[PDB]
Amino acid sequence: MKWNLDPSHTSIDFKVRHMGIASVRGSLKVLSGSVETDEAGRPIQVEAVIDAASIATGEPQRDGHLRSADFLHAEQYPEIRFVSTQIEPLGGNRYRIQGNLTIRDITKPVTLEAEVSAPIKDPWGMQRVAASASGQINRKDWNLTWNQVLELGALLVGEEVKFNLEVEAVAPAPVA
Ligand SMILES: CC(C)=CCC/C(C)=C/CC/C(C)=C/CC/C(C)=C/CC/C(C)=C/CC/C(C)=C/CC/C(C)=C/CC/C(C)=C/COP(=O)(O)OP(=O)(O)O
């Protein structure tokens, strides 16, 4: 069965190390996505489209820099895209999702560790299901570089981008 991601209750949150002593946190908004489940209700395929211009870290000048031609170039590349290539059930509600993540013109493999909830009938007719997932990427894999950075050799802006997803997905009534 096909579930559609609800952009209003899906969150993408990320963290990057700053000067080795702290983290900068940010978010991205999802535009759309879906999950297909097999007869057993295990997720088999998942895809999402993310609004690149939505990147937000709570400082407008920094967010401008992130969106600029110097970094994400969100005017030329309005989306970040994820498409799964393999989903492995791990037991219980756990799944490992391998997929391809596109940022600008570069696509690289990423791994998500996901946990899925039991579906509910929501207060408005629809079937609704949630999931949480975690992972990390190295921004340099997408040629997203930063600076002349110097501290001891250390980094102003870390290479690793840790992220957490909270997802809600929906399907029509007992009838699709
Ligand atoms: C059944 C069911 C519901 C199943 C569900 C399945 C499921 C889990 C589906 C999920 C669908 C989705 C949404 C999948 C998404 C997949 C993935 C991997 C998404 C990843 C998104 C992501 C994190 C993209 C990140 C891109 C980047 C490059 C972020 C970069 C952040 C960055 C470098 C920030 C700057 C931070 C540093 C510290 C700046 C310092 O600031 P400052 O000192 O002021 O400097 P300046 O001002 O100069 O900028």
UniProtKB/TrEMBL annotation:
It holds the Pfam family YceI. InterPro entries: Lipid/polyisoprenoid-bd_YceI, TTHA0802/YceI-like_sf. Residues 2-170 form the Lipid/polyisoprenoid-binding YceI-like domain. SUPFAM superfamilies: YceI-like. It comes from the Bacteria. This is Lipid/polyisoprenoid-binding YceI-like domain-containing protein.
